[PDB]
């Protein structure tokens, strides 16, 4: 009762397929063999059985292939995520039964081809710790240097792939200054630095209204008493 | 915007309002109520209204070279025909609607005697 | 080099960097500090000519500027529906009271 | 604006008339 | 369609959405929601006491519930200067105080060129 | 997922989250670094005993049920080469696994406090104009069991933000991760959150750190305009009678 | 009250200015 | 020095500048060109004329230097600051400027009776 | 002292309270009614083992240590006859022993709460004069596990009060206790309390049984003082005027 | 190894003496006696240890008499007090070793001779629940029935020592009116109800000069009387 | 041996050890305990002979009291210039009321 | 026994001893001497009298007793209470002191009258 | 004090006058 | 309000007394 | 006490204050508003001011052998001669105002239609 | 020097000091201090509200704040009954009604005196 994995990593880009190898060997007749992938959360997760007495097992995204003469079987992940980024192992083995495991391959998927973009990095200090902040570019050869007279300590940058499908990477380091550190980018052929990111009308006319009848009514005033005086005479 | 493109423009030094249909076409075309009122062409953006001492009511829209935009109904009471009818106005109302209908029945009396 | 109006709530400066003196025109007051005027309210026009010197990027040039102000609150909106509508009928009025002094001589 | 000053521009015109008038009416009583 | 009707007493205004006669609606101005208990939001009036010019003018929304207010039929544009106690005199009451006037002063005076000749 | 950290000659406690009504054995696996996940024993849960695997004398694992339907690993005198992630599984076919426990076993080397502390940074002034965006940063530092969880959360939401980790470097006898996140403009300025899932976290509450951002003479013009508007049309109902008084004598 | 002193100033000198010279008048 | 006069009748703001009568004038505005330009044909200039129609206060008021052909434009010693309520159909006119229409009204009322009087012989 | 109500075939977890340092072997004993206390057995802590009786295979016993010098007794398969009080005792001479902990195996048979129900009653009237004193008197009802604690406290102190209690006396299916407390004369009026231990209390915490207990005249002198002196200033112009009106004819 | 104490219960009464049998039976050399106590709260407390190679153990009030050629040893409590009372157990018995117990002996401690006291009995409901309070009294011979047409539940009395030396009793009883009940007591040959117990110096000077002034009033309004008068005739 | 005359706020009380026996004046009341008698109120001006006996100390000696009170609130102030101003006004105002009775007969 | 005739007139306050008129008497007050110590000049005895000026209602104000030469002051059975608001020119004058000057009033104005009528033969 | 009752002695002396005169009034009317 | 009832009362006896002397005093 | 000498005595059965300058000397020298206004000899220690009911107001202050103490304005409105002006004592000085002038009319008419 | 200036206006008790124009002063009672927030103490003024004669009457001093009390210049004495809505007759209001109400009788029956002559 043997599982053998002699596949210690792979990698396989983005919409591609990977064939996974898994030497079992055993002595029984009529026995079952499981494929589980393991995340970096540490969970157990049940891929496809394949039964040893009927034909190729697939369920969706996964294919076993199955050499029932030689000791050989084999899974398939067509059509590849960025999410089947994990450890996956052979299992073989009626409540009581165990599941021999193998010791495990390891799948990491690389994104797809991409034109190059440029850095454009920037700067973030808390008095005395630094921290190079580094946007998006698309091919992974990075060179995350600052520039200070008196280093304390430098801990290794961290390339992670952005959803856009390219990289950001952060470099910290501690410094005593911390404030005259400016960080420097020698990525695809053309240096960047983080220098040049661093650079009353209608009152008067009613007024105006109101003094003219008043004037037309010290008028129309005068003829009615002029002509009531004509009346009598 | 969400089919939303009428905005007056306000606060400045003048009394006047400016409908500004925030639409990117060419030759926008302005409307009041479901009629063509207006036109407009190029070198100028914002349609003029008047003063908003004349109180501009209506219901304005534009159209680009694209559907037709949804109306913005305009109410503006900067009234200044306004007058107050606290107890001072009603009171010197009734003043100057008896002792000039006294006068003129005292100037009638004495055209009415002569006759 | 122009010669800056800066601007207060209400107070129409006048900028230098070098010693105005002022040519003609409504003087403002003076103020106590050098390189500087006053011209007073937003609404009383003023209007003057006030040469000034250099600075010190652009010295030697004597400079110039008048500035000239018609923020009027003394202005009247003059109608031509309520003017000529009391105009023709005091006409009306002054034919009407040079009827009744020819009615008795 | 210049409405205060305005309005007793005529309340001065008035009061020209009724001194005008008050001193011909003590003239033509008394004597 | 159908605007929204305003109507300013004296120094209170108090407008009327009417398009959906009954059901739940709310108000907005400039994207501050009103309506939920001052202020009042019935359920077609809204009653801004204190109207003051230099708070309340602007971009008025009347929708029912569960519908976007960029989704509604349009919006008003409110630029309303009041008074405590006043009126407007449009042509409706100074083309009546002008008839009453003249019927009560020919009504008047041809009762004392009557009274006088007797 | 958590981790334990009792010392040599211990005894650790070790619960499954995976509940599963009426089953019948209760599995333990054990996996270590760059081994496989090997049997250790099994639960009878109609009889109550365990039956252990052909490598070991009783007396070093018990499997306890607080109550019912929920059970426990005890391991008793924790020796140094004890320590992986254990892994609880019941059958169905396929076989469920119960999310991992990692134990580690230490000679009581800590000798101060091994909680996380925050260090956190702000965003760059020159980021904030030609990027329409703003990031974070949230340094910890100085934890020993590294089973460390840091996630985002908005200021008042359940939403989880898209951060993007580092990996846990070492120190000299202390360990050390970041996270950071990317916001985009019209969410800005609003708070933010780093909560950090960790064992050694004071209270056993997990942490949470929050990231910052005239009238008058107008109304007796016309009072008084329409006053001498209606005196002119009583002289001219006078001007009638009289003219009408006048033109019979003519 | 500075404003509406002006219109009841006007008030009181037309009723005497037409009182003074309806009774100059009587004098015929 | 002289002075540009500047007659702002109703809209109409007519900017004189007598400083070059023997040669051809341009304008400027922000240092930016202004008449003579042939579009937006409001604007338009003469022997010294500049006449702007659709004036406002916010805009078109600031710095208008007259230079003549030929002239670098920092040459000029002399500039003007226009800052213009320009209104619709209003004039400025103080208090002694209606009170001289007062007396003229009362002078052409009362100057007509005495002569109708003396018609009647 | 407490106790533990586990159903039959289930887990019971019996600690206790003993605080020794630097012990070598854990004793356990088991008493029940009428018979004596026998050990069960006894756990060595330098190699943590359990030595077990002449009577039983192992897979029944379990000594828990889950921190440092603290020890469970974990039993296993539990049948009805496993129901008495267990102490864990220590040497040193003579023998410690640690304050018993009751365990009750029952076969389900609750059905409902069995929380205590008080029913608090109050000193009569005529007891209050003739006595100078009054008697409270606080009665419990329907609680199964039996070992129940009923001591009387103060409104603010941390005294106890001379309380008598009466014999647990059984209902059908359930128990009920009560106690009572006799306060002299001018301790009457405040408040007490009938603190009550138990196991099926809510949320652990036992319960807490509050017990209740002219200027007027020399103004209108003055006032019609100053209108007599007003009435004849007046009569005095008029006698002017008269005498001036008859000196005119003599 | 056996231990045999064939004694059930003990009364003795306050400050009298009590001793206490085991039968132990063993085949050592050399082995102690220890003597515990268990209170009601369940709690084991060590009291006294008879080494089997010295004399007679005693520690305060407790002294063990022992019997090397039979098998008897035997505890004295002298002078007694009121919380001795307890269950007493004998046990047989270098840190590996366990003690073998008895059946454990009862010790039930009796108040001393005191004269008759009369009962006092009280009566206090709860609307449904009533009970009938005995205040204090010395011979146990107590009676104490309610009176009630309408019976539901009646639960023994609960008779303990006061801290006066005599004894207090409560006997609850649920019934149906509750109010009109009345316990009532055959203490001692005479019976005890429940229904004996069951019933300026200047305002004088200004009234004055008031008076005064009205006295003047009163003469100058006759003078210009009598004067107008005189002008008339 | 005096007789102690205490003090409520109004009674004015006479207090003794044997048996007060009037002699004679304001009687005031009686009381129901011996050896004690109320006058009553402050302002009412008791005032009379009161003998008493001995007491323990000073006993074969029979003792006496007046009591005498000026606690007056009905005296009045008299002032030398509005009586002597109210009087001779009234002298004159009926020397005139005796003129018009000799004017008529 | 013979009473102590208390004559309060103003302030003075005069009080006769008539129970020794055939001996030289003394006055004490509070078991003090007062009267016959020649200081405080206001106090003073006579044959029978004792007048006390300034007087007040706090001080001076209790047992009075009055006793011959020869006299042991424990001897006299008679004492004084004398409690007084003495005043300042005020008197005690009731309701009935006042109607019978308003009668006489009215009895002497209008018995005036009918006598100047019959001198008027 | 003593103002209550010496204020109507004078209104005692009023009605006195007051019913000599309704008496010596209705003498000199009917008879 | 009985102090002030006396100040009342000489009112209403001046005005009955004097009127009912001056209409008395018509009598010649 | 701080040269704080005056105090005044009062809540006794007449109506009289005491000004009392505890200060101990001999020949206290009293003042008032700077002048020596009195003087004292022994046997008396509390000057009098007077009644409370004929208000005294003033400045007062002593002297011992040391130097002079400082004041005390004494103020004292126990009024007596207040009238009370509520709504019926204004409106029963229009019926003593108003009746007497009348009757006195009715009288002068009389006297002068007699002559 | 100085002295304190007290004016009862009704039933309210004003009175200032003033000695110092412009500082924070503070002011007592039998020292019990009264000012800092019933009763008022201004920069300068003190507002005795409900002022009855037995419990606000006796020695008040005002002075500047950092300054002993005993200190001061000197104390008051204050001992003021007042009532409400009352006046207090001194001789500036008995020689003003005597005068006007000769002045008003004799312009008045002079006046009946030419209207009964004619």
């Known amino acids: 009762q043997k599982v053998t994995q002699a596949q210690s990593s792979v990698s396989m880009p983005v919409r591609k397929a990977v064939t996974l190898n898994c030497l079992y060997e055993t002595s029984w007749w009529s026995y079952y063999i499981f494929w589980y992938k393991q995340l970096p959360s540490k969970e157990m997760i049940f891929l496809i059985r394949?039964?040893?007495?009927?034909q190729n097992a697939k369920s969706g995204r996964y294919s076993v292939n199955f050499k029932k003469a030689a000791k050989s079987v084999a899974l398939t992940i067509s059509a590849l995520q960025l999410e089947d980024s994990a450890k996956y192992f052979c299992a073989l083995g009626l409540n009581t039964d165990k599941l021999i495991f193998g010791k495990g391959t390891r799948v990491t998927v690389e994104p797809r081809s991409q034109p190059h973009t440029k850095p454009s990095v920037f700067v973030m200090k808390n008095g005395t710790n630094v921290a190079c902040l580094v946007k998006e570019f698309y091919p992974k050869d990075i060179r995350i240097n600052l520039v200070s007279s008196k280093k304390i300590t430098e801990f290794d940058p961290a390339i992670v792939i952005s959803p856009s499908g390219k990289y950001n990477a952060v470099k910290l380091g501690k410094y005593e200054d911390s404030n005259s550190v400016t960080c420097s980018v020698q990525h695809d052929n053309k240096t960047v630095h983080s220098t040049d990111f661093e650079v009353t009308e209608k009152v008067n006319m009613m007024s105006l209204t109101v003094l003219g009848l008043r004037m037309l009514f010290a008028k129309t005033v005068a003829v009615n008493f002029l002509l009531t005086a004509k009346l009598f005479f | 915007k969400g089919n939303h493109l009428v905005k007056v423009y306000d606060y400045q030094e003048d009394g006047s309002v400016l409908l500004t249909c925030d639409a990117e076409a060419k030759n926008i075309t302005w409307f009041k109520d479901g009629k063509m009122i207006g036109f407009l062409t190029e070198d100028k953006k914002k349609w003029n209204l008047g003063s908003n001492a004349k109180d501009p009511r209506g219901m304005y829209q534009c159209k680009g070279s694209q559907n037709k935009s949804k109306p913005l109904q305009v109410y503006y009471r900067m009234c200044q025909n306004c007058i107050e009818l606290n107890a001072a106005t009603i009171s010197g109302f009734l003043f100057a609607e008896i002792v000039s209908i006294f006068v003129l029945a005292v100037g009638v009396y004495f055209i009415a005697g002569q006759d | 080099f122009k010669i800056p109006i800066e601007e207060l709530e209400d107070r129409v400066f006048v900028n230098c960097n070098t010693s105005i003196t002022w040519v003609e025109g409504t003087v403002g007051t003076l103020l106590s500090d050098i390189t500087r005027l006053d011209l007073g309210k937003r609404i009383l026009d003023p209007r003057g000519i006030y040469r000034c010197n250099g600075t010190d990027i652009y010295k030697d040039k004597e400079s110039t500027v008048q500035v000239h102000y018609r923020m009027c609150q003394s202005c009247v909106e003059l109608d031509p529906a309520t003017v000529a509508g009391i105009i023709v009928t005091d006409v009306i009025a002054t034919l009407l009271l040079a009827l009744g002094v020819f009615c008795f001589a | 604006l210049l409405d205060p000053k305005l309005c007793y521009l005529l309340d001065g015109i008035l009061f020209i008339y009724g001194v005008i008038l008050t001193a011909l009416f003590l003239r033509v009583k008394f004597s | 369609q159908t605007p929204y009707k305003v109507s300013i007493s004296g120094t209170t205004v108090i407008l009327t959405c009417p398009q959906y006669p009954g059901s739940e609606i709310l108000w907005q101005h400039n994207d501050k929601n009103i309506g939920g208990d001052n202020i009042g939001s019935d359920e077609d009036h809204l009653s801004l006491k204190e109207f003051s010019e230099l708070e309340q003018s602007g971009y008025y929304v009347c929708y029912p519930r569960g519908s976007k207010p960029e989704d509604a039929n349009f919006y008003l544009y409110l630029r309303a200067r009041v008074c405590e106690n006043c009126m407007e005199m449009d042509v409706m009451s100074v083309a009546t105080i002008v008839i009453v006037d003249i019927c009560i002063t020919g009504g008047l005076l041809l009762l004392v060129y009557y009274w006088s000749k007797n | 997922t958590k981790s334990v950290t009792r010392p040599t000659r211990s005894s650790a406690e070790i619960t499954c989250d995976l509940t599963?009504?009426?089953?019948?054995?209760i599995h333990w696996y054990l996996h270590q670094e760059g081994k496989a996940p090997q049997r250790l024993l099994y639960?009878?849960?109609?009889?109550?005993?365990?039956?252990?695997e052909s490598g070991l004398s009783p007396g070093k694992y018990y499997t306890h049920t607080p109550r019912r339907w929920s059970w426990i690993l005890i391991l008793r005198n924790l020796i140094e080469n004890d320590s992986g992630v254990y892994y609880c599984a019941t059958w169905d076919y396929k076989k469920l696994f119960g999310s991992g426990t990692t134990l580690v076993v230490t000679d009581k080397q800590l000798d101060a406090d091994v909680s996380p502390k925050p260090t956190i940074f702000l965003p760059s002034i020159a980021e904030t104009k030609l990027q329409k965006a703003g990031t974070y940063l949230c340094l910890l530092e100085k934890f020993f069991p590294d089973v460390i969880k840091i996630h985002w959360q908005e200021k008042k939401s359940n939403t989880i933000l898209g951060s993007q980790e580092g990996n846990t470097m070492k120190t000299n006898d202390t360990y050390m991760k970041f996270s950071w996140l990317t916001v985009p403009e019209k969410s800005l300025d609003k708070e933010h959150r780093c909560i950090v899932r960790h064992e050694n976290n004071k209270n056993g509450v997990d942490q949470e750190i929050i990231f910052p951002p005239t009238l008058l003479l107008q109304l007796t013009n016309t009072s008084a305009y329409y006053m001498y508007l209606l005196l002119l049309l009583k002289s001219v109902v006078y001007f009638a009678i009289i003219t009408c008084c006048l033109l019979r004598r003519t | 009250l500075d404003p509406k002193l002006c219109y009841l100033l006007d008030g009181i000198l037309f009723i005497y200015g037409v009182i003074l010279t309806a009774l100059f008048l009587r004098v015929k | 020095q002289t002075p540009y006069k500047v007659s702002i009748s109703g809209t109409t703001v007519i900017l004189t500048c007598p400083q070059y009568p023997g040669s051809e004038i341009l304008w400027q505005h922000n240092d930016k060109n202004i008449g003579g330009d042939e579009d937006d044909k409001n604007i338009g200039s003469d022997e010294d004329h500049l006449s702007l129609k659709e004036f406002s206060e916010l805009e078109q008021s600031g710095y208008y230097v007259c230079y003549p052909r030929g002239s670098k434009p920092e040459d000029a010693n002399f500039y003007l600051y226009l800052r213009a309520r320009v209104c619709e159909n209003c004039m400025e006119m103080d208090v002694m400027s209606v009170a001289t229409i007062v007396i003229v009204d009362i002078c052409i009322t009362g100057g007509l009776l005495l002569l109708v009087y003396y018609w009647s012989k | 002292t407490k106790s533990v109500t586990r159903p039959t075939r289930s887990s019971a977890e019996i600690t206790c309270?003993?605080?020794?340092?630097?012990?070598?072997?854990?004793?356990?004993y088991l008493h029940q009614e009428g018979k004596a206390p026998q050990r069960?057995?006894?756990?060595?802590?330098?190699?943590?083992?359990?030595?077990?009786?002449?009577?039983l295979s192992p897979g029944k016993y379990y000594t828990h240590t889950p921190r440092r010098w603290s020890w469970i007794l974990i039993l296993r398969n539990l049948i009805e006859n496993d129901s008495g009080v267990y102490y864990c005792a220590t040497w040193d001479y003579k023998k410690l022993f640690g304050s018993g902990t009751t365990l009750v195996v029952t076969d389900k048979q609750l059905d409902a709460d069995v929380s205590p129900k008080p029913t608090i009653f109050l000193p009569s009237i005529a007891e209050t004069k003739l006595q100078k004193a009054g008697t409270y008197l606080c009665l419990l009802e329907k609680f199964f596990p039996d070992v129940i604690k009923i001591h009387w406290q103060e409104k603010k102190s941390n005294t106890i009060l001379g309380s008598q209690e009466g014999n647990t006396m059984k209902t059908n299916d359930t128990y009920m206790k009560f106690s009572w407390l006799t306060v002299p004369e001018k301790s009457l009026d405040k408040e007490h309390r009938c603190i009550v231990r138990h196991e099926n209390n809510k949320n652990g915490v036992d319960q807490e049984i509050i017990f209740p207990p002219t200027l007027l005249l020399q103004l209108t002198n003055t006032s019609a003082y100053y209108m007599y002196l007003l009435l004849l200033l007046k009569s005095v112009v008029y006698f002017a005027i008269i005498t001036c009106c008859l000196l005119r004819r003599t | 190894q056996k231990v045999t104490q064939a004694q059930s219960s003990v009364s003795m009464p306050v400050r009298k003496a009590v001793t206490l049998n085991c039968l132990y039976e063993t085949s050592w050399w050399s082995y102690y006696i220890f003597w515990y106590k268990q209170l009601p709260s369940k709690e084991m407390i060590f009291?006294?240890?008879?080494?089997?190679?010295?004399?007679?153990?005693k520690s305060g009030r407790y002294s063990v008499n022992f019997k090397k050629a039979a098998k008897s040893v035997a505890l004295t409590i002298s002078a007694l007090q009121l919380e001795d009372s307890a269950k007493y157990f004998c046990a047989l018995g270098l840190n590996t070793d366990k003690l073998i117990f008895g059946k454990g002996t009862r010790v039930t401690v009796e108040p001393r001779s005191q004269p008759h006291t009369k009962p006092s009995v009280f009566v206090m409901k709860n609307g449904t629940n009533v009970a009938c309070l005995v205040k204090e009294f010395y011979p146990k011979d107590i009676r104490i029935n309610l009176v009630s047409s309408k019976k539901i539940t009646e639960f023994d009395p609960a008779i303990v020592i006061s801290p006066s030396g005599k004894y207090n009793a409560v006997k609850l009883g649920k019934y149906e009116d509750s109010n009109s009940v009345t316990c009532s007591v055959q203490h001692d040959n005479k019976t005890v109800h429940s229904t004996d117990f069951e019933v300026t110096e200047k305002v004088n000077m200004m009234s004055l000069t008031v008076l005064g002034l009205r006295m003047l009033f009163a003469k100058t309004v006759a003078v210009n009387f009598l004067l107008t008068a005189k002008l008339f005739f | 041996f005096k007789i102690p005359i205490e003090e409520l706020e109004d009674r004015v009380f006479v207090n003794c050890n044997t048996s007060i026996t009037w002699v004679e004046g304001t009687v005031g009341t009686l009381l129901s305990d011996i050896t004690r008698l109320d006058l009553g109120k402050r302002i009412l001006d008791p005032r009379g002979i009161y003998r008493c006996n001995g007491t323990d100390i000073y006993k074969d000696k029979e003792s006496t009291v007046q009591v005498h009170y000026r606690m007056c609130q009905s005296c009045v102030e008299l002032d030398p210039a509005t009586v002597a101003g109210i009087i001779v006004t009234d002298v004159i105002a009926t020397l005139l009321l005796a003129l018009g009775v000799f004017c008529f007969a | 026994q013979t009473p102590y005739k208390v004559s309060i007139s103003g302030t003075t306050v005069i009080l006769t001893c008539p129970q020794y008129p055939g001996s030289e008497i003394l006055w004490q007050h509070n078991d003090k001497n007062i009267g016959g110590d020649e200081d405080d000049k206001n106090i003073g005895s006579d044959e029978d009298h004792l007048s006390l000026k300034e007087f007040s209602e706090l001080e001076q104000s209790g047992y009075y007793v009055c006793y011959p030469r020869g006299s042991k002051p424990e001897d006299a059975n008679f004492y004084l209470y004398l409690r007084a608001r003495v005043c300042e020119n005020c008197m005690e004058m009731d309701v009935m002191s006042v109607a019978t000057i308003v009668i006489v009033d009215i009895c002497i104005t209008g018995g005036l009258l009918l006598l100047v009528y019959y001198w008027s033969k | 004090l003593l103002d209550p009752k010496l204020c109507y002695l004078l209104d005692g002396i009023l009605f006195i006058y007051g019913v000599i005169l309704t008496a010596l009034f209705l003498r000199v009317k009917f008879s | 309000l009985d102090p002030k009832l006396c100040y009342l009362l000489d009112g209403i006896l001046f005005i009955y007394g004097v009127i009912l002397t001056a209409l008395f005093l018509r009598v010649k | 006490k701080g040269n704080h000498l005056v105090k005044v005595y009062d809540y006794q059965e007449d109506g009289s204050v005491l000004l009392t300058c505890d200060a101990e000397a001999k020949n206290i020298t009293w003042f008032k508003d700077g002048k020596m206004i009195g003087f004292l000899t022994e046997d008396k220690k509390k000057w009098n001011l007077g009644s409370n009911a004929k208000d005294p107001r003033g400045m007062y202050q002593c002297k011992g052998s040391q130097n002079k103490s400082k004041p005390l304005q004494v103020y004292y409105r126990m009024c007596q001669n207040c009238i009370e002006l509520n709504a019926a004592t204004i409106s029963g000085f229009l019926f003593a105002e108003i009746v007497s002038i009348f009757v006195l009319a009715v009288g002068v008419y009389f006297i002068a239609g007699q002559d | 020097q100085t002295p304190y200036k007290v004016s009862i206006s009704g039933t309210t008790v004003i009175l200032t000091c003033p000695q110092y124009p412009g500082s924070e002063i503070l002011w007592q009672h039998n020292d019990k201090n009264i000012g800092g927030d019933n009763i008022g103490s201004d920069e300068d003024h003190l507002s005795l509200k409900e002022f009855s004669e037995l419990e606000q009457s006796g020695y008040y001093v005002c002075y500047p704040r950092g300054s002993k009390p005993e200190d001061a210049n000197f104390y008051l004495y204050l001992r003021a009954r007042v009532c409400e809505n009352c006046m207090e007759m001194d001789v500036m209001s008995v020689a003003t009604i005597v005068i006007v109400d000769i002045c008003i009788t004799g312009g008045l029956l002079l006046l009946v005196y030419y209207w009964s002559k004619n």
């Open positions: 599963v009504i009426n089953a019948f054995y």
């Open positions: 639960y009878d849960v109609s009889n109550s005993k365990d039956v252990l």
């Open positions: 394949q039964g040893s007495d009927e």
